[PDB]
Write a protein that binds this ligand. Structure first.
Ligand SMILES: *Cc1c(COP(=O)(O)O)cnc(C)c1O
Ligand SMILES: *Cc1c(COP(=O)(O)O)cnc(C)c1O
Lengths: 405, 405
């Protein structure tokens, strides 16, 4: 940086602390990643200066010839990546992408069927403290109490009983592949739209490592960050039949001016995801997750669903008589970043939990492989088995430091 | 830029076109500005990598010690600038800031009183194609048909008749000072909350050149871009009594993860606005607007309200028998960027209009002064009086080129 350090010492000092933190810590929060310098440069561009309400070639303000090229690059590359008939790259966030789809197809009070939030569903899939559960009538389907896999018969029974106008599939804490064909079959049976929120798994979908929801869903929402490794923001994919409505829901429905610099960054990240090396990256993410899962089981830990099909795993800490909160706190002391997470049928509150959620996307981006996964598992074992031993925690701290160099 | 040009030639080429466009054109769109290199550097930072749901010292994820410092810098500086009891710097946009306030105090179907959209009100103040008019029952107050000043007796009569739960003041196309004391008096009479959306005038408010809504309003919403000259995004200011509710409305109510890099950029822009030279800048904005207004009147143009108290003016093109659409198009041909804008009681549709809206914030940022205002007025006169003369338009083009160098 050249201008920020002189203009704003306080902000610069805090940014520099954050940069050093990102390097020093082991980032295992499953939604986290590190974007490329190219992506950041696009976000740091003069495109922040442009008001571009509307869409490419159909803007409400003049002077948009070049931002149109950028937005179209983002839309076309997204269509290449995911095979969707239409893309909308303007959502400010995953939350706003979801908001717009709900705005498109639902009226206030309509019934919507989503994944149980305590079983892996997202806040925007019907939390009573979120606009989703306040604005619409959410009902929930669950995972099996033993296998922790979505119970598709439960999805079906809930859909037939409650007659939702919309069914939502996808999750922020579900470690197995989701069967979109089955969701669509159930949707079809009850005459419901199907929305898939692929935010967590979008990079995996792009790399052909998770089945693609696009062919099965009327609407697919996503973040551009997370496994897709782009800037923070949202995107909607859909069939051409809903394109006009989706575009209108975003603007003038729920947003104003788009963030053209972030859209530039989205185009860049989509460019990166189209490359062969991104596919290799994503395979290493899933390989690392599988390895870390097996290594954790070797250390004596129980995993929700007994492992993982994707980038993420959930540790059921009940056998160790620990809460997620305790584990998260002690791991923080040694430089490992996880989050407490409810496990299915958790006897604890969402503020305490019986679990921790772990993902490999971030550590894979920094070049960690199988050997590093074994060592991360060994460190986690050392820490969680010796929570009252400062000797053990210092050893962990040193081993964490060895990994991040 | 160092990495973007190699990684993504297509995106880089389009960005470079946009950068050159920003320099070559005369930007008169009243909401536009140019941010500092420091602001852009903050937006281009590694803070995009951080998930920070929640608030400083009350986050739902670990590792937020440094982004907390950044967000608190933004909140404290905003409180210094505007004298508010509480700031929320997380809204992704002006639209989301408004969305959150509505979410805080209103139920679906509640009556809200806002400025007539054709008289200067914003899309988010009750457009039937926007979430505001779909979700709530909007009624409108108007400006006087002659003076084009808000009719405060109309505000009062509408409030007494319709009994709104919320009254909204502020505008995207209103060239005079808004009397917040009078709005609050009317709000008090009918037991309505008062919300002021100061997006357009926020930089002027910060510089003491427009009366501050904070002392009079329960809630103040704003963009951080526009006259405030920050990155694109939103902010909510409010009394401490509503702080908890406002924070909860933003998250977990309407958004997910905040954009911490944009929040850094917000802190930077607030730092800049606190400086003496920003105050001098803002005075030049208003001085330039007054000068440009008078110079346009000298060229024979009629202005809505007969002039301006702020950064913006509206030309009533009816005396020249032109639509806003025609004027906007021809000005675009010579390198002057305006927008068509409805004038109060416009006989034309919002897609055609009888007006153009013009603001001086952007040209002032690039160092234009009174002499430049006279010349911009002279060029606009030359063009709009000779729409069928290619000779005249080429002369205009050359004079525009002389100004931008
Ligand atoms: C992260 C996430 C979101 C929300 O994205 P934000 O950008 O944080 O609003 C929505 N759905 C799922 C499944 C997510 O993981
Ligand atoms: C620009 C504006 C908004 C919306 O801000 P976005 O960031 O474009 O959503 C809201 N209110 C007023 C008065 C505005 O001028």
């Amino acid at each position: 940086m050249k201008y920020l350090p002189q203009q704003d010492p306080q902000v610069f000092a805090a940014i520099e602390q954050e940069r050093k933190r990102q390097h020093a810590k082991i980032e295992l929060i499953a939604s986290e990643n590190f974007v490329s310098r190219a992506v950041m440069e696009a976000q740091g561009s003069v495109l922040t200066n442009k008001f571009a309400e509307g869409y490419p070639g159909r803007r409400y303000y003049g002077g948009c010839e070049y931002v149109d090229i950028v937005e179209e690059l983002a839309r076309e590359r997204a269509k290449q990546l995911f095979g969707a008939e239409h893309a909308n790259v303007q959502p400010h966030s995953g939350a706003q992408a979801n908001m717009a789809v709900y705005f498109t197809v639902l009226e206030h009070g309509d019934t919507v069927l989503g994944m149980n939030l305590s079983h892996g569903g997202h806040l925007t899939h019907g939390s009573p403290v979120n606009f989703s559960g306040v604005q619409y009538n959410f009902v929930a389907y669950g995972v099996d109490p033993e296998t922790h896999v979505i119970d598709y018969d439960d999805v079906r029974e809930k859909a037939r009983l409650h007659r939702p106008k919309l069914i939502v599939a996808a999750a922020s804490a579900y470690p197995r592949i989701i069967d979109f064909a089955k969701f669509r079959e159930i949707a079809d049976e009850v005459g419901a739209y199907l929305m898939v929120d692929m935010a967590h798994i979008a990079g995996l979908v792009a790399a052909g490592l998770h089945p693609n929801p696009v062919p099965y869903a009327h609407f697919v929402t996503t973040t551009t960050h997370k496994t897709l490794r782009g800037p923070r923001g949202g995107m909607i994919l859909c069939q051409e039949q809903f394109a006009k409505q989706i575009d209108k829901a975003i603007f003038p429905g729920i947003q104003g001016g788009p963030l053209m610099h972030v859209i530039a960054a989205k185009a860049v990240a989509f460019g990166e995801a189209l490359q062969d090396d991104f596919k290799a990256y994503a395979k290493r993410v899933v390989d690392n997750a599988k390895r870390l899962a097996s290594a954790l089981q070797n250390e004596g830990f129980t995993l929700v669903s007994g492992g993982t099909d994707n980038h993420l795993l959930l540790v059921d800490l009940r056998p160790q008589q620990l809460t997620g909160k305790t584990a998260e706190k002690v791991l923080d002391e040694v430089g490992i970043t996880v989050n407490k997470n409810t496990i299915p049928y958790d006897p604890e509150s969402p503020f305490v939990t019986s679990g921790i959620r772990i993902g490999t996307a971030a550590v894979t981006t920094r070049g960690f492989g199988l050997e590093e996964m074994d060592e991360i598992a060994a460190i986690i074992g050392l820490v969680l088995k010796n929570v009252g031993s400062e000797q053990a925690l210092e050893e962990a701290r040193q081993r964490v430091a060895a990994l991040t160099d």
